[PDB]
Amino acid sequence: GRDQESTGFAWWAGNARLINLSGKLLGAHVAHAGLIVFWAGAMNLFEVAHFVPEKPMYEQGLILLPHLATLGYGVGPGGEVIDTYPYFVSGVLHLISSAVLGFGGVYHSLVGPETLEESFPFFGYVWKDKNKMTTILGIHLIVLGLGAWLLVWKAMYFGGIYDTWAPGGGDVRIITNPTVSPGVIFGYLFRSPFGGDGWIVSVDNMEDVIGGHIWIGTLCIFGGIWHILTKPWAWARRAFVWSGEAYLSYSLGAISIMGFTACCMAWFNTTAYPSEFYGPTGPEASQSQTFTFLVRDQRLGANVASAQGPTGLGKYLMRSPTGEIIFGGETMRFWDFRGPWLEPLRGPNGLDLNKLKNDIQPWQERRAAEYMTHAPLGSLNSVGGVATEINAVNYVSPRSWLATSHFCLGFFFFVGHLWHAGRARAAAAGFEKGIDRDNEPVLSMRPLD
């Protein structure tokens, strides 16, 4: 290693001593990737070993297994786990590959070449060499595009992916006609983030997901090819700071945005995050509660359409601010919800009174009751229910865990982007270690008013 004597960086900032050491930096990155794969495999093995078939996935605190279920692995019609062997296979493969990755990282960090700019010119680089950095960026863009295309191939030729909107209940479908319309793809991208619109979180069928992935794979491959063959222009050289910490800050900001988007998608989406494996969402539980109370009160001989509440608005059915027929109560704020068990009862102008008066199905009622009781509310020590409940239920929704953790991560990485962007801009200018007593900039300016 090194020391503060010959570096100027303390032990709590020791990873900054390998900014200009290409081999050791590569070793550190490979070791970290091995750590990530190790966690994936170990967590998959931990979750597969603690899974019982008498309870749904969201009732047992699983977050990695529902990811494999949505890919159509070991699941059946209706969203019931049938086989649990592919999860074991995936976990074993990840855990074993982590060993190779960790060995590579340890080798490159301990006994590998310290600075690979003289023995391996192809892999060597300088942070200020724009062409080499752009070439590396293009290579990794090509790799990511290949990964997106690999995801696309699964839904088409290798058995497909789980579709929660499939006719006759959710099942593993095959996507034959993806939506590759420019108007459809641009509609999701340049949509408002507010209610009703929802930006890209509002994607409501797997055809749109597969079409967007085709688009993103093609774009990434083309951009990688473009960057391999070119170098930044004058307007780009005039606008950016060119150093390793600057590149790190850019990446930190990008992945902070990604983390916030992931949190929102986990909280709100139902297509890519089926409720069969993640439980009901926020609005879904409220809509289910109103639906089941309407059904129960209708079974007791009541007129749900003409029933009037304490405020005079409607106990079960009211009108949305645009005219659509929606559920009444405080769930009037969640009328944008759209779920597979509720859509069949919805007509062109909202809920159909005759359909919910004569054509409500027992499976719909069971889904509504289950999503009502398993609402995404809980406590830090995993106690289900509102904050004024008793210790009877040990449950916290998998959506809550992912949403909270990823919001925290996104905020902290935004703060990291701020820190590193500021430090890079200051260090490149040349005053990151303090002000110069001999030449203080403020002393040379005219005093203010």
Binding site: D3, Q4, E5, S6, T7, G8, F9, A16, R17, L18, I19, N20, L21, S243, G244, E245, A427, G430, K433
Partner: protein, 107 residues
């Protein structure tokens, strides 16, 4: 004003750690020194006014001075017989304690 030799940091084996504790670094006073990110040095060193005030804050109030350590304590006077007696006593006490914990509990 401050004598570095009288600060009690002369009994440290590791030269780099010794230099770290006095707030000194021979590498950094060179005009051609470059830190990991790639910034040249102005020859100040760790502290600009090291000659004016004697030493740094590290060389002013150290918290690890092996010179002031007691001459005894680096060797056990009781020797091997004391260690053997200690081993016997700790084995006996551990047995007695585990027996008492098991007996006083509900098995």
């Amino acid at each position: 004003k401050i004598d570095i030799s009288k600060q009690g940091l002369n009994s440290i084996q590791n030269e780099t750690v010794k230099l770290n504790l006095m707030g000194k670094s021979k590498t950094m006073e060179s005009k051609d020194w470059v830190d990991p990110q790639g910034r040249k040095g102005k020859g100040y060193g760790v502290y600009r006014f090291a000659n004016k005030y004697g030493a740094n804050v590290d060389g002013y109030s150290p918290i690890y001075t092996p010179d002031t350590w007691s001459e005894s304590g680096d060797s056990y006077k009781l020797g091997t017989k004391g260690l053997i007696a200690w081993a016997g006593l700790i084995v006996v006490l551990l047995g007695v304690g585990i027996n008492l914990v098991i007996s006083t509990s509900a098995l």
